[PDB]
Amino acid sequence: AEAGITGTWYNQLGSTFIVTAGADGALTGTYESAVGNAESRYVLTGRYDSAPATDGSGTALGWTVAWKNNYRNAHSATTWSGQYVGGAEARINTQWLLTSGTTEANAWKSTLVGHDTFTKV
Amino acid sequence: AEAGITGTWYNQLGSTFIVTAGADGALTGTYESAVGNAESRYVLTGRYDSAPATDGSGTALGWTVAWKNNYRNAHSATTWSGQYVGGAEARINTQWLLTSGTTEANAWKSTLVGHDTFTKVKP
Amino acid sequence: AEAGITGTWYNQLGSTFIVTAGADGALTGTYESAVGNAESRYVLTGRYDSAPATDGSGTALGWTVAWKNNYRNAHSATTWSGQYVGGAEARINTQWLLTSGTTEANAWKSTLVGHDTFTKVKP
Amino acid sequence: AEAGITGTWYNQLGSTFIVTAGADGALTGTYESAVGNAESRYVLTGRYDSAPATDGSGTALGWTVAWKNNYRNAHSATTWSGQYVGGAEARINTQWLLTSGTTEANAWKSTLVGHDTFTKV
Numbered sequence: 001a002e003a004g005i006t007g008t009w010y011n012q013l014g015s016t017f018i019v020t021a022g023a024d025g026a027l028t029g030t031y032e033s034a035v036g037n038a039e040s041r042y043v044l045t046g047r048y049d050s051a052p053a054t055d056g057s058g059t060a061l062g063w064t065v066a067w068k069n070n071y072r073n074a075h076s077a078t079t080w081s082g083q084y085v086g087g088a089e090a091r092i093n094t095q096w097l098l099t100s101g102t103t104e105a106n107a108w109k110s111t112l113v114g115h116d117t118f119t120k121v
Numbered sequence: 122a123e124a125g126i127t128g129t130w131y132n133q134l135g136s137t138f139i140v141t142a143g144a145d146g147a148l149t150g151t152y153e154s155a156v157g158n159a160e161s162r163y164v165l166t167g168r169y170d171s172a173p174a175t176d177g178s179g180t181a182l183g184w185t186v187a188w189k190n191n192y193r194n195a196h197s198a199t200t201w202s203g204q205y206v207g208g209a210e211a212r213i214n215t216q217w218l219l220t221s222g223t224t225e226a227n228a229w230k231s232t233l234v235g236h237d238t239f240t241k242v243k244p
Numbered sequence: 245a246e247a248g249i250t251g252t253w254y255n256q257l258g259s260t261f262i263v264t265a266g267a268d269g270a271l272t273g274t275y276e277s278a279v280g281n282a283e284s285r286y287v288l289t290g291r292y293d294s295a296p297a298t299d300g301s302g303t304a305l306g307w308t309v310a311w312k313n314n315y316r317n318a319h320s321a322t323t324w325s326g327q328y329v330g331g332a333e334a335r336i337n338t339q340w341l342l343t344s345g346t347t348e349a350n351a352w353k354s355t356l357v358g359h360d361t362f363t364k365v366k367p
Numbered sequence: 368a369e370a371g372i373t374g375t376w377y378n379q380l381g382s383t384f385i386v387t388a389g390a391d392g393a394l395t396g397t398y399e400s401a402v403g404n405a406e407s408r409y410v411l412t413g414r415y416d417s418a419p420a421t422d423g424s425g426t427a428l429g430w431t432v433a434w435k436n437n438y439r440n441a442h443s444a445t446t447w448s449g450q451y452v453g454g455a456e457a458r459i460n461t462q463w464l465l466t467s468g469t470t471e472a473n474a475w476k477s478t479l480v481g482h483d484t485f486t487k488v
């Protein structure tokens with residue numbers, strides 16, 4: 001179920017995700033990406049489902065980062081959807097969608113999809 | 122888009138999205154889905170990139186809804202990633218990922234993908 | 245759907261899809277994209293699940309196009325996964341993944357996702 | 368570039384992918400999944416781009432499997448889109464879409480998305 005979601009997590013690209021999970025299902029924190037048109041920290045907000053089921057399943061959650069801060073504005077946003085699994089080795093396994101603002105003409109290629117796995121290691 | 126995004130929006134399935142965009146790039150609201158293991162409203166939170174470009178580009182944004190409220194708990198969460206295009210007929214075009222909590226064995230089938238188009242209602 | 249799928253189809257972007265469905269569940273044809281780093285026709289191959297169900301369910305199918313022909317090489321490939329719904333107005337609703345070849349460092353940005361709806365033309 | 372794509376590959380679920388790559392860009396073979404409403408082998412057909420670029424990049428490719436054979440018909444099809452990287456440890460990194468045939472009513476939940484990594488180990 002929910003619990004040790006709060007913390008500093010890192011993914012395979014070396015990005016850093018620092019989050020706080022509130023008792024009612026809210027997620028707040030900052031994100032720093034190791035790749036892309038990004039630099040320093042960005043604000044993130046999400047939600048996680050605070051009453052996961054009791055057949056050892058993961059806890060579903062998701063969050064968003066709009067890539068604008070006081071250093072850069074990449075006119076895009078990424079949303080990560082996945083589930084947390086705690087235990088000896090806790091992991092957050094996600095799939096994400098990165099949409100950039102385009103003109104109608106380029107709207108067909110506005111969205112990248114990928115997957116990231118986060119650990120506190 | 123903060124004034125332009127704020128409002129009531131509906132999508133092709135008949136689901137309702139009520140949102141407020143804050144000066145800081147924040148999006149907060151409630152979502153009511155016309156389909157699925159959902160009932161009543163659910164809280165949503167997201168962000169939108171406040172200073173787009175001039176030009177006729179869309180404003181990127183995204184939000185999340187964990188499908189748990191006082192009436193139902195579906196143990197899943199959906200994230201919508203898309204762009205807002207304003208105008209007389211403003212629209213928000215998105216693609217979404219719906220992940221259900223699963224055992225490690227069934228994790229390969231935990232995520233659904235789709236796309237929704239939202240139309241804003243007057244006011 | 246083998247007779248129903250066989251034909252010329254166009255999607256919202258103005259791209260052409262000419263296909264033949266074989267008794268064995270095979271799909272073979274050519275694709276012409278209205279957008280992207282593409283020119284002329286490209287070969288496509290796919291499969292479709294020949295014995296659907298009775299009922300008013302769609303026929304699942306999917307196909308791939310590697311964007312290389314005698315005129316252009318974009319070093320990318322797109323796969324479309326969707327369902328065929330026949331009737332007077334038959335449609336093929338799909339979601340696709342377009343992967344470009346990259347270095348390991350840029351692999352995180354190698355795949356685009358989208359959705360296309362195709363309309364069959366008479367004959 | 369292209370080359371040792373032909374062979375028997377296995378993914379993290381233990382599924383087996385046996386493919387033959389033709390000199391003009393065709394891929395043919397069989398697929399056996401370790402999970403899902405599937406059993407025994409299924410026919411697969413795909414394409415790979417036979418002239419990848421010369422900045423050590425992967426070779427883009429994709430293939431499809433309709434899940435019907437003489438044992439089962441799951442009324443679905445999966446398409447894998449990704450790139451091959453050869454070398455000491457060759458890998459095929461993909462993202463896939465699994466669409467099941469549904470009624471219009473259930474069309475919103477007809478497609479699963481996931482990612483698989485294949486090795487010859």
Ligand SMILES: O=C(O)CCCC[C@@H]1SC[C@@H]2NC(=O)N[C@@H]21
Pocket residue numbers: 011013015032033034035036037038067074076078096098114116352
């Ligand atoms: O380039 C941009 O548009 C802004 C930075 C995007 C970074 C992406 S989001 C998904 C992937 N996971 C990460 O940790 N960073 C990249």
Ligand SMILES: O=C(O)CCCC[C@@H]1SC[C@@H]2NC(=O)N[C@@H]21
Pocket residue numbers: 132134136153154155156157158159188195197199217219235237475
């Ligand atoms: O069934 C669930 O797990 C919760 C309800 C999911 C409803 C989905 S979210 C994406 C799509 N868009 C909608 O408006 N409703 C469905």
Ligand SMILES: O=C(O)CCCC[C@@H]1SC[C@@H]2NC(=O)N[C@@H]21
Pocket residue numbers: 108255257259276277278279280281282311318320322340342358360
């Ligand atoms: O630019 C490329 O790499 C090759 C052309 C890609 C065209 C894409 S495939 C999905 C979408 N549907 C179309 O008909 N065209 C675009």
Ligand SMILES: O=C(O)CCCC[C@@H]1SC[C@@H]2NC(=O)N[C@@H]21
Pocket residue numbers: 229378380382399400401402403404405434441443445463465481483
């Ligand atoms: O259950 C079905 O509809 C048929 C079997 C699906 C097996 C899937 S395809 C993606 C993932 N990768 C595998 O090797 N098998 C599963």
Ligand SMILES: [Cl-]
Pocket residue numbers: 142143147148149
């Ligand atoms: Cl606010």
Ligand SMILES: [Cl-]
Pocket residue numbers: 265266270271272
């Ligand atoms: Cl044939």
